[PDB]
Nucleic acid binder design. Structure first.
Ligand SMILES: [Zn+2]
Ligand SMILES: [Zn+2]
Ligand SMILES: [Zn+2]
Ligand SMILES: [Zn+2]
Lengths: 659, 1211
RNA sequence: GACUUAAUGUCACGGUACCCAAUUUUCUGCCCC
RNA sequence: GGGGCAGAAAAUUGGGU
């Protein structure tokens, strides 16, 4: 009777763990104790272990699979091991005759839903044959009690997703008091093909999604259903894609005051396919100019929403006021991940200073060809164009690899990259898309951030530089746009010995050998803050990318909290090149450099430097004390044909900010 | 023109199953090992090894592109194009392997675009325009063909390869994300591969030969491409185990397994010619382990028989397999994250005129501390144990520093020097371009082994249970650690245009200069200071790879002949004279130098230090039950190992002492379980989810040459509470180091501090160090006896100033009346029994040894120890101490206990007397009893007074306070130094004029105490304080000529009024427990304890007085606070100035130790009928008349117990 | 010759078997028919 | 008319990646 009693105790503790009341931190310890108890049971009872102990083991292994979070972007190996162990331990249970109808039904249900979860995690381990076997087992057992166990409801909807008729359980699933709206919508659309009831449940489902964190089960499975609809060439996928976009935007609008987001490996495709939906709506033979313009504006809005936030894996996630919000957000997300299974002032996209044309960039991986949503206030007209970025990505990777070995000697690769930008984006030099003599603001996407868009070269024999005609300033996203002179220096001896010594243009509250305290101690907001130090890159957490100042330097996070006296000041971070702050590009680059932290604090604009340049050029830029795009043309930055290395230095300087 | 090309591997290359192109994708191991050597079977064993010609071709074309780039695409004067490494999937099929690697490119300089008429050497070595394409071997239409490379000699897989599990370690933490197995082969025996290269086009032979000479590594190893008694010993072990089971000694068959396993360190001559301990001369049993009758013969002789019958496998292999065998038999009877990891062409164009060079860093990686390069157990390393942890060795058993571990440590140090690196990702389609990766892709380094194939010393480890301060259930494991001082050759090749300052910083960090001392943490177990290698003998060379590449090809880059380079002259290898010094590198002093901060200090131990290494106690001669731990240091200067081994406190013991001190200071120790926690102890010392921020090192003994005898032989015993003699099996002798207050032991240890400690954490570590200095945590075993007590700490002057700054910061009025003895002046019995009763109190809620509770007290007590009668504490280390055996052989002459020539009292005796007194005082159970003795003696002790078993049933107040098995006591006594006084009791006629030949000391007979089953059991036995030494002094000549010389024992005696000073470091003691211990120490005037031999003769009467009581939560309490402690002790006693005689049991107790001479009562044992000194005529006092049932009734127990001073001759 | 390669593309030198645990707890070198 | 014990009981691996 030892097996039965300890199995009953294990069932008690598993039921207590399944209650959503307990925090996930203690849930791990209690379920580990349950695992220890059940394995201790299994040690002496390997000879045809009873059905109850095996069922408890399967439930416990499912729960150990759920409690372990995906540390990286990919599915964690521990979850796969837990799934494999659960199915392996339940194979012996299902291979033997339990003798109880209820126990056999429970075993079949848990095995089939475990196979479904393994298929969701990785189709290689369990293919559609496994799903068909799960259907056979469920039909044989008859575990279709929708009003008793939501476990049966989940297996029913998964089975119906396999393209097999489920009209036998249709009446039971019609009521489904324990189900959620998305399951009802899936059942209505798949079996009965009734779009009205499907959309009626869909609206409630997305309304509920509006108030749930991104780590919930509902988000991933609803985006999966939407992409299933898109692959089915249906017509209602666009509306729910846009509605899920809206729910995601509203949900994270308030949460994450530090410009943070939760990664779930399906957010990017959700935004991509909502973008595709609104794009198809825009080009759906619209007779009215107003509706097409509004659709393109919505295109720009969704492009900006993805850029306006962060993307941090919880491995990197795992004064003190900022840390409180960090801990609260992490706790809420990690709680909502497991709750799925257990029972200052905003800026409008249309208000822009007169004579400024903005170029919003969006790179959609699903479609495979990027977009450039432009907007000029001369005619107040929104228009967008499409372009290929894969070959441009090859050329950019070529330049990045050649630069990290031969920084100054890779000027030819920079010229090639600029020519590739001009060729792959011919609308930049087009009069209709971008009028000449108009100041341009860029909002580049993931890997377009590193591109010197201001240095684009037109596809001509004597292709004119894009910098000569337009004045360009960049921006990580549209959500970032909103006296004396101060200098800070932490460089090495032998460089920049002139500004520190001969300082007749200002630098009253200056600090040679500056520390993080010196940057934080700037009380009054100056007219120009100059920071002289080469910062280091954080290849994992962009929140901890630092400027190498004295006393350990100041990171991205410490700028957001300690530094307050910098509002409305044209900071010039012309000491560290822009590309030693963040990591390097691989397919996408969603990391934010230190200049973005300065912009978020309230700096009027950072005159950064894309690539490493000799000290003389940036020293001359600092000595240029009149209020970029005009200096580069006059200093010789348009001589790429004759002087490649001269083009390499001048182009590097870009102003990250919106005047 | 067929070209025969021969491979040669100079370090262990890697192996995988061949599988197939269409079948590789199903297997992760073979998909990861595409670049390894391939194994194909011929049963799943005894196959053939080979290297694919495609892999060799890829290496050759990579070398071709590197040679052309180094020459701006122009080899030997003929221009070479860029080739083409892009395949259009529309116009054909993709290659079997895709590059996803940066391709070195140059200018064109070609007369015409390459076609199949005048192709450049690069194109015809690539096979661009040959008649053979991506299709298979069909016809030999290849312009250049690379045939398969088969091994150059069945060939069983286990004979060639050896499975090893590799790793991928974090950087923020010291943990590993995942791991993966590998089949690293045997480069020494099976390390030569032969294949054929066929080249139809004769225009590009020179470039092909240069590329062959330029291929620097293949399959994970350096290459030089050159043109043209089980199943019977196990049965005998089973027989041995069965015979052990016949003797009911299966609990120690495991210990015999460890002794056999560690016999590998000893030579075969140990078992050939008897060097094992032979036991005592008259033991009649011999050794408890080696003189065991197994199958009718002693274990030593049959082990010699086995060694003679198993000479084939050799002493090391035979003893290893034997130990594993008995371990398996003992286990049989009792019951006993593998992560195996789009289409882009990235042309890299080196600038014209750049200068690229190759730098060789040849040196030696001397181990400053014993190292541990972990490896998986045997029977799990098979491709296709007894020791818990194994160290990595090759087929020749020599110690190995694997290329993977060295490369990983170098990468970690390089990332530290840069300060901004990546967590290396697996399966990425784009080369990582971070700073550390760029230099790591240019650094190649050689796997190297030490020329020292000797068995590794086993370093044992346990885990203490904080609740009881004893060993934990299933906490014992052993680790094989390499010797300290071993020198491994160090090879490091960097290829590039300039030597990075970060690699120079790593070398200087690793180098062992006059003050650098070496900082290359290699391998695992870094938290216990295992693997800090001090790289030395550094020599930096360089190749002019641009204008001197012909001789680089000719010498093959000196690959595999780095020993010749370290010994000393090849062309184009001028030494690198521009190696920046330590104080010239910004990254070094910025990131690497402040990474680890050394805290060196010298512990001064003023007591016998005993680390209790028991496995080596069995094998080493002398028959010591517990000897001190000693290291095994390899003398690199003179080769071999030092014959004299260094005594030390294990770095694990050091780390555990500091960790326990910190945990008890804060309170983290004692938690239910350490989950993913960020507590103070978890952060400082690491946990299961991170790495330690502090790494400790061995407490090596530096003051060892100033001792006449470094190890002092101390005998111990356990005395039965009832009979008063030693227990049935309790005599044991330890072998601690010689430690005295006048001449202490100096142990210079150190630990390293990471640059992340906050002020609170550094304050915590300094508080732990101060607690170590204050003596709260004695080193080694028997700490509650007086073993390894720390007398102070002397921090070195090289410690950082901030760290050093924080570090530098009675009479009792009770008088017992007494009776009888002064009312007559009559002879009494030398011993009496204290029937205290069976009312025993047990405390279920035991006091844990976790953080010091504020309610209770802890500290130290300084007590003076005055003697009222001569004290006998023999030093039984020397059986001939008085040099009197020559005149009278067989006489046991002893010397007074002394360490380094100063008279001391071992703390064991003081603790024994105090524990017995306290147990009698509090009605504690009989902690030590001769159970199952002739029903049985232990079967008639009622029920409560039995010795305490495990904590299930609770612990008696004496057992709670002084401790029992699996519960460390809360009071530690110390060795009592002399501190002045009248030293010796002169006899004027003794052999040394300062001794006293004692009478016949016979074992007690409980039959007299219990003459029949009617009497249940007498109480505890105590001896009165009679002045009976006077009769022995007077009858010195009458006892040296009448008693047997072989039975008489003589020893030096201390004179009257000798004082002794010792400490009592009570900890976590209750408010009343401290008072009761104070009363036990100093019962008051006219009451004194008995110590040492001759207690029935009146010898060794000791009076204890208290000097000063301390308490910390340093606060010397006053006399008022000393009172009201004993008061509540009395209050607790009654409910179970104080008036102790109120309680009858305490009244009789204090009557037993009442001194009736502080008039002169005479007390002695009776005699057998008309024996010597019969005195029959008047006060007969003889046995067989006093003991006769007719003459005297069975009321002897009535008069012998509960009557502390009843007369015998009149009644 | 096969037992094994595919050829205009093999960063696998592309990954430290790594992290946590105090050989310690208890015991007078003692003693009489 | 004689020396009696000279070691005893535990823990010898558990957790992770
Ligand atoms: Zn060519
Ligand atoms: Zn990297
Ligand atoms: Zn902790
Ligand atoms: Zn007890």
């Amino acid at each position: 009777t030892r097996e039965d009693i300890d199995r009953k105790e294990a069932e008690r503790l598993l039921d207590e763990a399944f209650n959503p009341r307990t925090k996930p931190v203690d849930r791990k310890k209690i379920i580990n104790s349950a695992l220890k108890i059940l394995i201790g049971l299994y040690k002496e009872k390997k000879d045809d272990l009873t059905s109850a102990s095996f069922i408890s083991i399967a439930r416990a292994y499912y729960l150990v699979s759920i409690t372990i979070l995906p540390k990286g972007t990919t599915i964690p190996e521990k979850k796969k091991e837990a799934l494999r162990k659960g199915i392996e331990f339940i194979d012996r249970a299902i291979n033997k005759f339990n003798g109880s109808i209820l126990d056999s039904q429970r075993a079949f249900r848990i095995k089939s839903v475990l196979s479904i979860e393994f298929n969701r995690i990785d189709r290689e381990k369990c293919d559609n044959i496994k799903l068909k076997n799960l259907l056979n087992e469920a039909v044989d057992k008859g575990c279709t009690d929708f009003d008793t166990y939501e476990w049966d409801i989940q297996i029913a909807i998964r089975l119906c997703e396999l393209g097999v008729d489920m009209e036998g359980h249709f009446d039971n699933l019609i009521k489904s008091n324990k189900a959620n709206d998305l399951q009802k919508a899936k059942a209505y659309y798949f079996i009965k093909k009734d779009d009205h009831k499907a959309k009626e449940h869909m609206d409630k489902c997305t309304a509920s999604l509006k108030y749930t964190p991104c780590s919930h089960r509902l988000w991933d499975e609803t985006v999966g259903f939407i992409e299933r609809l898109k692959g089915d060439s249906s017509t209602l996928w666009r509306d729910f894609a846009i509605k899920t976009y809206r729910s995601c935007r509203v949900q994270e609008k308030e949460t994450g005051t530090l410009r943070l987001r939760w990664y779930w490996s399906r957010h990017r495709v959700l935004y991509d396919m909502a973008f595709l939906a609104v794009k198809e709506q825009a080009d759906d033979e619209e007779p009215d100019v107003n509706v097409k313009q509004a659709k393109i504006k919505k295109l720009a809005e969704i492009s900006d929403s993805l850029k306006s936030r962060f993307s941090l894996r919880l491995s990197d996630m795992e004064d003190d006021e900022s840390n409180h919000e960090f801990k609260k957000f992490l706790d809420k997300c990690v709680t909502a991940y497991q709750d799925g299974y257990v029972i200052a002032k905003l800026l409008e996209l249309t208000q822009v200073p007169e004579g400024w044309v903005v170029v919003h960039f969006y790179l959609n991986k699903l479609e495979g060809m990027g977009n450039a949503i432009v907007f000029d206030k001369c005619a107040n007209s929104w228009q967008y164009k499409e372009f290929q970025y894969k070959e441009l990505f090859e050329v950019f990777l070529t330049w990045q690899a050649n630069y990290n070995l031969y920084k100054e000697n890779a000027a030819e690769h920079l010229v090639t990259l600029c020519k590739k930008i001009g060729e792959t984006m011919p609308f930049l030099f087009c009069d209709n898309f971008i009028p000449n003599g108009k100041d341009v603001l860029f909002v580049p996407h993931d890997f377009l951030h590193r591109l010197p868009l201001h240095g684009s070269i037109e596809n001509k024999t004597n292709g004119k530089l894009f910098l000569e005609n337009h004045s360009c300033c960049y921006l990580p996203a549209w959500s970032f746009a909103s006296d004396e002179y101060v200098l800070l220096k932490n460089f090495d001896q032998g460089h920049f010995e002139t500004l520190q010594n001969n300082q007749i243009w200002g630098t009253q509250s200056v600090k040679d050998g500056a520390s993080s305290d010196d940057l934080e101690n700037i009380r009054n907001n100056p007219r120009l803050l100059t920071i002289l130090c080469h910062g280091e890159a954080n290849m994992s957490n962009p929140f901890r990318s630092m400027l190498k100042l004295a006393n350990g330097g100041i990171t991205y996070l410490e700028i957001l909290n300690s530094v307050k006296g910098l509002k409305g000041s044209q900071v010039i971070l012309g000491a560290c090149e822009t590309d030693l702050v963040p990591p390097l590009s691989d397919v996408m680059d969603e990391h934010y450099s230190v200049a973005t932290a300065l912009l978020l604090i309230g700096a009027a604009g950072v005159v950064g430097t894309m690539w490493k340049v000799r000290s003389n050029k940036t020293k001359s830029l600092i000595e240029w004390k009149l209020e970029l795009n005009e200096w580069q043309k006059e200093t010789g930055g348009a001589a790429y044909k004759d002087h490649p290395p001269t083009f390499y230095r001048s182009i590097a300087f870009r102003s990250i900010g919106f005047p | 023109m067929n070209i025969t090309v021969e491979l040669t591997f100079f370090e262990p290359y890697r192996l995988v199953e061949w599988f197939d192109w269409d079948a590789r994708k199903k297997s992760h191991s073979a998909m990861r090992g595409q670049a390894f050597a391939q194994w194909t079977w011929k049963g799943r064993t005894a196959g053939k090894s080979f290297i694919t010609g495609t892999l060799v071709r890829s290496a050759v074309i990579k070398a071709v592109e590197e040679l052309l780039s180094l020459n701006n695409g122009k080899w030997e004067g003929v221009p070479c194009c860029n080739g083409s490494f892009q395949t259009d999937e529309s116009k054909g099929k993709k290659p079997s392997f895709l590059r996803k690697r940066h391709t070195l490119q140059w200018q064109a300089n070609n007369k015409n675009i390459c076609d199949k008429e005048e192709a450049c050497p690069f194109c015809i070595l690539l096979g661009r325009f040959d008649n053979a394409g991506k299709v298979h071997e069909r016809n030999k239409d290849y312009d250049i063909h690379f045939s398969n490379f088969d091994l150059d000699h069945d060939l069983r897989l286990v004979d060639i390869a050896s499975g090893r599990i590799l790793n991928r370690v974090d950087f923020d933490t010291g943990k590993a994300k995942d791991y993966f197995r590998t089949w690293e082969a045997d480069y020494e025996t099976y390390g030569t591969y032969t294949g054929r290269i066929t080249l139809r086009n004769e225009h590009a032979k020179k470039l092909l030969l240069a590329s062959l000479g330029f291929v620097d590594k293949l399959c994970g190893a350096l290459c030089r491409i050159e043109v043209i008694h089980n199943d019977e010993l196990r049965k005998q072990a089973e027989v041995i185990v069965e015979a052990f089971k016949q003797n009911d000694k299966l609990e120690k068959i495991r210990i015999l397994a460890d002794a056999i396993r560690t016999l590998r360190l000893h030579g075969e001559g140990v078992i050939e010619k008897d060097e094992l301990p032979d036991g005592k001369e008259e033991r009649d049993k011999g050794h408890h382990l080696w003189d065991i009758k197994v199958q009718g013969t002693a274990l030593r002789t049959k082990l010699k028989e086995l060694w003679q019958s198993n000479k084939d496998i050799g002493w090391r292999k035979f003893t290893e397999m034997l130990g594993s065998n008995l371990y398996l038999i003992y286990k049989k009877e009792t019951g006993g994250t593998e992560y195996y990891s789009s289409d882009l062409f990235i042309p890299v164009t080196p600038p014209e005129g750049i200068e690229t060079k190759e730098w060789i860093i040849v040196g030696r990686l001397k181990a400053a501390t014993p190292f541990y390069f972990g490896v998986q157990q045997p029977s799990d390393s098979i491709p296709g144990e007894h020791t818990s942890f194994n160290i990595l060795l090759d087929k020749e058993n020599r110690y190995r520093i694997p290329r993977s571990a060295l490369r990983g440590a170098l990468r970690r140090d390089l990332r530290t020097a840069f300060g901004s690196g990546c967590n290396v990702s697996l399966g990425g389609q784009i080369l990582c371009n971070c700073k550390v990766c760029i230099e790591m892709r240019r650094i190649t380094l050689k796997d190297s082994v030490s020329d020292f194939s000797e068995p590794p010393e086993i370093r044992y480890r346990i885990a203490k249970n904080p609740g009881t301060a004893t060993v934990e259930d299933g906490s014992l494991f052993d680790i094989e650690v390499g010797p300290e001082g071993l020198t491994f050759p160090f090879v490091l090749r960097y290829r590039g245009h300039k030597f990075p300052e970060q690699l120079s910083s790593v070398i200087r960090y690793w180098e062992e200069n006059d003050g650098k001392n070496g900082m290359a943490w290699l391998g695992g177990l870094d938290s216990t200071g295992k693997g800090r290698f001090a790289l030395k003998d550094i020599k930096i060379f360089e190749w002019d790879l641009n204008q001197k590449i012909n001789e680089y090809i000719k010498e093959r880059g000196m690959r595999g002949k780095e020993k010749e380079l370290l010994e000393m002259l090849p062309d184009g290898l001028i030494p690198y004279k521009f190696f920046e010094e330590r104080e010239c590198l910004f990254p070094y002093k910025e990131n690497l130098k402040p990474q680890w901060s050394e805290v060196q200090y010298t512990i001064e131990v003023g007591s016998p230090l005993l680390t209790a290494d028991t496995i080596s106690a069995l094998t080493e001669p002398g028959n010591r039950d517990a000897i001190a731990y000693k290291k095994r240091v390899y003398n690199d200067g003179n080769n071999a190992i030092e014959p004299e081994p260094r005594f030390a406190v294990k770095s694990e013991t050091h780390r555990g002492i500091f960790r326990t001190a910190v945990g008890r200071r804060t309170g983290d120790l004692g938690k239910e379980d350490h989950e993913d926690c960020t507590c103070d102890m978890c952060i400082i010392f690491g946990n299961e989810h991170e790495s330690s921020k502090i790494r400790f090192e061995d407490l090596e003994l530096i003051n060892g040459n100033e001792f006449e005898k470094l190890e002092k032989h101390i005998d111990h015993v356990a005395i039965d509470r009832f009979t008063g003699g030693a227990l049935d099996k309790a005599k044991f002798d330890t072998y601690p180091l010689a430690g005295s207050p006048k001449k202490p032991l100096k142990l210079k240890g150190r630990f390293w501090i990471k640059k992340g400690f906050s002020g609170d954490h550094k304050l915590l570590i300094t508080t732990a160090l101060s607690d170590i200095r204050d003596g709260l945590y004695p080193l080694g075993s028997k700490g509650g006896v007086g073993y390894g007590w720390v007398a102070g700490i002397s921090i070195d002057d090289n410690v950082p100033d901030d760290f050093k700054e924080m570090i530098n910061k009675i009479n009792n009025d009770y008088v017992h009346p007494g009776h009888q003895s002064p009312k007559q002046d009559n002879i009494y019995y030398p011993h009496y029994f204290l029937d205290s009763g069976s009312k025993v109190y047990r405390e279920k809620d035991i006091i844990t040894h976790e953080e010091f509770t504020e309610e209770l007290l802890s500290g130290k007590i300084n007590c003076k120890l005055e003697t009222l009668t001569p004290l006998i504490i023999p030093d039984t280390s020397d059986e001939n101490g008085l040099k009197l055996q020559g005149n009278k052989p067989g006489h046991k002459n002893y010397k007074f206990f002394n360490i380094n020539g100063e008279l001391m009292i071992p703390g064991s005796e003081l603790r024994g007397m105090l524990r017995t007194h306290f147990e009698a005082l509090t009605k504690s159970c009989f902690a030590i009893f001769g159970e199952d003795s002739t029903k049985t003696l232990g079967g008639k002790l009622d029920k409560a007074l039995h010795p305490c078993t495990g904590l299930s049933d609770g612990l008696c107040p004496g057992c709670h306070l002084f401790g029992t098995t699996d519960y460390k006591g809360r009071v530690k006594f110390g060795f009592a130094k002399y501190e002045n006084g009248p030293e010796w009791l002169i006899t004027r006629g003794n052999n040394p004029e300062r001794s006293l030949t004692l009478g016949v000391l016979e074992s007690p007979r409980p039959a007299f105490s219990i003459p029949d089953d009617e009497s249940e059991i007498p109480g505890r036995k105590f001896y009165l304080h009679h002045n009976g030494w006077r009769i022995i002094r007077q009858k010195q000549l009458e006892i040296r000529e009448t008693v047997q010389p072989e039975r008489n024992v003589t020893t030096e005696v201390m004179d009257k009024g000798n004082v002794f000073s010792f400490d009592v470091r009570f900890e976590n003691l209750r408010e009343w427990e401290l008072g009761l211990l104070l009363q036990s120490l100093d019962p008051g005037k006219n009451i004194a304890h008995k110590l040492g031999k001759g207690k029935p003769y009146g010898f060794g009467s000791v009076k204890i007085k208290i000097d000063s009581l301390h308490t910390f939560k340093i606060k010397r309490v006053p006399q008022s606070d000393i009172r009201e402690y004993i008061n509540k002790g009395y209050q607790k006693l009654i409910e179970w100035l104080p008036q102790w005689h109120v309680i009858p049991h305490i009244d009789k107790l204090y009557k037993l130790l009442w001194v009736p001479f502080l008039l002169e009562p005479d007390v002695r044992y009776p005699v057998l009928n008309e024996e010597s000194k019969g005195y029959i005529e008047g006060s007969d006092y003889t046995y067989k008349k006093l003991g006769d049932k007719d003459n005297l009734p069975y009321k002897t127990r009535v008069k012998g117990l509960t009557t502390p001073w009843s007369p015998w001759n009149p009644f």
